[PDB]
Structure 1
Amino acid sequence: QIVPDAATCPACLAEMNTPGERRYRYPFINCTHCGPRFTIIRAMPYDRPFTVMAAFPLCPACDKEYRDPLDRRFHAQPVACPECGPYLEWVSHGEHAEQEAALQAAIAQLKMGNIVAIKGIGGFHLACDARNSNAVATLRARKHRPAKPLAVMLPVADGLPDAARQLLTTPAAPIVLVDKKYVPELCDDIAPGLNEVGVMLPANPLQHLLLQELQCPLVMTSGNLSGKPPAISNEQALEDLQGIADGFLIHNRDIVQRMDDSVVRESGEMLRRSRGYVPDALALPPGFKNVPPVLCLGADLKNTFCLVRGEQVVLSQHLGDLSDDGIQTQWREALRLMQNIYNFTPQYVVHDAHPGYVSCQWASEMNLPTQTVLHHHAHAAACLAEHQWPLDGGDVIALTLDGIGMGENGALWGGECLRVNYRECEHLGGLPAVALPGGDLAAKQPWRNLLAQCLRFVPEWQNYPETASVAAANWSVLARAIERGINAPLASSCGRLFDAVAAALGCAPATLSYEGEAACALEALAASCDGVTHPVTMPRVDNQLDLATFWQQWLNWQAPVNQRAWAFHDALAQGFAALMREQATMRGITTLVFSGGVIHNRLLRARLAHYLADFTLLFPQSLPAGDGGLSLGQGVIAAARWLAGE
Structure 2
Amino acid sequence: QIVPDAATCPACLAEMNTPGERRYRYPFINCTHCGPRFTIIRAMPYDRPFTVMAAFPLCPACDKEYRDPLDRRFHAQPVACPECGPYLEWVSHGEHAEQEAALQAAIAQLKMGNIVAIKGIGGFHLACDARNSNAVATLRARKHRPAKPLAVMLPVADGLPDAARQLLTTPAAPIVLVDKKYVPELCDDIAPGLNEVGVMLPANPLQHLLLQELQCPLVMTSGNLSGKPPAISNEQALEDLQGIADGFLIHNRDIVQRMDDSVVRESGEMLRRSRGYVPDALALPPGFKNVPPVLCLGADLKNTFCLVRGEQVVLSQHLGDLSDDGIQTQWREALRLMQNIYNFTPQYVVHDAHPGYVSCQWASEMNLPTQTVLHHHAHAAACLAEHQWPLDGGDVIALTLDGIGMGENGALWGGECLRVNYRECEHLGGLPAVALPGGDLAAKQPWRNLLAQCLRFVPEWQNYPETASVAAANWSVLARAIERGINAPLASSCGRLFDAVAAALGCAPATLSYEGEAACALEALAASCDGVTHPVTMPRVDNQLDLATFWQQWLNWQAPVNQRAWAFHDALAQGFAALMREQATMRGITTLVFSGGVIHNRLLRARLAHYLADFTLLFPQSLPAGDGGLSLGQGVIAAARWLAGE
TM-score computed with the length of structure 2 as normaliser: 1.00
Using the alignment, how far apart are the partners of 1:225 and 1:496 within structure 2? 27
Residue by residue over 1:390-422, the C-alpha shift from the partner in whole angstroms, topping out at 9 and shown as x without a partner, is 000000000000000000000000000000000
Using the alignment, how far apart are the partners of 1:517 and 1:408 within structure 2? 28
Residue by residue over 1:296-320, the C-alpha shift from the partner in whole angstroms, topping out at 9 and shown as x without a partner, is 0001000000000000000000001
Using the TM superposition, give the Cα deviation of residue 325 of structure 1 relative to its aligned residue in structure 2, in angstroms: 1.6
Equivalent position SS for 2:573: helix
Using the TM superposition, give the Cα deviation of residue 633 of structure 1 relative to its aligned residue in structure 2, in angstroms: 0.1
Using the TM superposition, give the Cα deviation of residue 143 of structure 1 relative to its aligned residue in structure 2, in angstroms: 0.2
Using the TM superposition, give the Cα deviation of residue 15 of structure 1 relative to its aligned residue in structure 2, in angstroms: 0.1
Using the alignment, how far apart are the partners of 1:359 and 1:219 within structure 2? 33
Residue by residue over 1:50-72, the C-alpha shift from the partner in whole angstroms, topping out at 9 and shown as x without a partner, is 00000000000000000000000
Residue by residue over 1:606-644, the C-alpha shift from the partner in whole angstroms, topping out at 9 and shown as x without a partner, is 000000000000000000000000000000000000000
Using the TM superposition, give the Cα deviation of residue 187 of structure 1 relative to its aligned residue in structure 2, in angstroms: 0.1
Residue by residue over 1:510-545, the C-alpha shift from the partner in whole angstroms, topping out at 9 and shown as x without a partner, is 000000000000000000000000000000000000
Equivalent position SS for 1:592: strand
Using the TM superposition, give the Cα deviation of residue 368 of structure 1 relative to its aligned residue in structure 2, in angstroms: 0.3
Using the TM superposition, give the Cα deviation of residue 472 of structure 1 relative to its aligned residue in structure 2, in angstroms: 0.3
Using the alignment, how far apart are the partners of 1:453 and 1:522 within structure 2? 17
- 2:89 is aligned with 1:89: yes
Using the alignment, how far apart are the partners of 1:79 and 1:190 within structure 2? 36
Using the alignment, how far apart are the partners of 2:228 and 2:178 within structure 1? 29
Residue by residue over 1:23-68, the C-alpha shift from the partner in whole angstroms, topping out at 9 and shown as x without a partner, is 0000000000000000000000000000000000000000000000
Using the alignment, how far apart are the partners of 2:617 and 2:638 within structure 1? 24
Using the alignment, how far apart are the partners of 1:9 and 1:319 within structure 2? 27
Using the alignment, how far apart are the partners of 2:423 and 2:613 within structure 1? 27
What's 1:28 paired with? 28
Equivalent position SS for 1:491: strand
Equivalent position SS for 1:140: helix
Using the alignment, how far apart are the partners of 1:472 and 1:137 within structure 2? 32
TM-score computed with the length of structure 1 as normaliser: 1.00
Residue by residue over 1:188-244, the C-alpha shift from the partner in whole angstroms, topping out at 9 and shown as x without a partner, is 000000000000000000000000000000000000011111100000000000000
Using the TM superposition, give the Cα deviation of residue 463 of structure 1 relative to its aligned residue in structure 2, in angstroms: 0.2
Using the TM superposition, give the Cα deviation of residue 590 of structure 1 relative to its aligned residue in structure 2, in angstroms: 0.1
Equivalent position SS for 1:177: strand
Residue by residue over 1:466-520, the C-alpha shift from the partner in whole angstroms, topping out at 9 and shown as x without a partner, is 0000000000000000000000000000000000000000000000000000000
Using the TM superposition, give the Cα deviation of residue 443 of structure 1 relative to its aligned residue in structure 2, in angstroms: 0.1
What's 1:563 paired with? 563
Equivalent position SS for 2:398: strand
Equivalent position SS for 2:256: coil
Using the alignment, how far apart are the partners of 1:390 and 1:178 within structure 2? 34
Equivalent position SS for 2:2: coil
Name stretches of at least 5 consecutive residues in structure 2 with no aligned partner.
none
Using the TM superposition, give the Cα deviation of residue 574 of structure 1 relative to its aligned residue in structure 2, in angstroms: 0.0
Residue by residue over 1:125-156, the C-alpha shift from the partner in whole angstroms, topping out at 9 and shown as x without a partner, is 00000000000000000000000000000000
Equivalent position SS for 1:402: strand
What's 1:496 paired with? 496
Using the alignment, how far apart are the partners of 2:97 and 2:322 within structure 1? 38
Question: Segments of 4+ in structure 1 off by > 2 A?
Answer: none
Instruction: Summarize the alignment of residues 181-580 of structure 1 with structure 2, pairs less than 5 Å apart.
Output: 181-580=181-580
Equivalent position SS for 2:322: coil
Using the TM superposition, give the Cα deviation of residue 261 of structure 1 relative to its aligned residue in structure 2, in angstroms: 0.1
Residue by residue over 1:1-29, the C-alpha shift from the partner in whole angstroms, topping out at 9 and shown as x without a partner, is 00000000000000000000000000000
Using the alignment, how far apart are the partners of 1:485 and 1:55 within structure 2? 60
Equivalent position SS for 1:113: coil
What's 1:643 paired with? 643
Equivalent position SS for 2:577: helix
What's 1:167 paired with? 167
Residue by residue over 1:158-213, the C-alpha shift from the partner in whole angstroms, topping out at 9 and shown as x without a partner, is 00000000000000000000000000000000000000000000000000000000
Residue by residue over 1:563-619, the C-alpha shift from the partner in whole angstroms, topping out at 9 and shown as x without a partner, is 000000000000000000000000000000000000000000000000000000000
Equivalent position SS for 1:379: helix
Using the TM superposition, give the Cα deviation of residue 440 of structure 1 relative to its aligned residue in structure 2, in angstroms: 0.1
Using the alignment, how far apart are the partners of 1:539 and 1:616 within structure 2? 23
Using the alignment, how far apart are the partners of 1:621 and 1:225 within structure 2? 30
What's 2:634 paired with? 634
Equivalent position SS for 2:418: strand
Using the TM superposition, give the Cα deviation of residue 324 of structure 1 relative to its aligned residue in structure 2, in angstroms: 1.0
Using the alignment, how far apart are the partners of 1:77 and 1:612 within structure 2? 52
Using the alignment, how far apart are the partners of 1:273 and 1:597 within structure 2? 14
Equivalent position SS for 1:258: coil
Equivalent position SS for 1:309: strand
Using the alignment, how far apart are the partners of 1:230 and 1:7 within structure 2? 21
Name stretches of at least 5 consecutive residues in structure 1 with no aligned partner.
none
What's 2:111 paired with? 111
